[PDB]
Amino acid sequence: TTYKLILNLKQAKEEAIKELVDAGTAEKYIKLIANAKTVEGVWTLKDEIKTFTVTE
C-alpha cells in the first residue's frame, strides 16, 4: 500500500524467460511467475530457481 510499488511486470516477467534462457532451469518455475502479480514475487521466482532453494 505504501512500502511497495509496482513499476512494471512486463520487465519482471520478460526477465523470467531471459534468465531461464541464460540459465536454463526448471521452466515450471518460470510458468509460476507468469501469474506473478507483484514485481518482487516475479523477480524472486526466477532467482529462487537460480539458487534452487535449500531444503523446502
Side-chain angles (χ1 to χ4, degrees), residues 2 7 10-11 17 20 25 31 45-46:
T2 57
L7 32 290
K10 240 216 287 218
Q11 175 80 343
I17 308 83
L20 228 86
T25 191
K31 186 138 98 107
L45 295 150
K46 56 192 204 101

Side-chain angles (χ1 to χ4, degrees), residues 14-38:
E14 286 254 313
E15 281 307 82
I17 308 83
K18 181 75 103 235
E19 298 270 29
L20 228 86
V21 186
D22 269 332
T25 191
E27 312 128 306
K28 307 118 64 143
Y29 251 120
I30 200 300
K31 186 138 98 107
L32 225 158
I33 86 98
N35 232 314
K37 197 215 157 202
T38 40

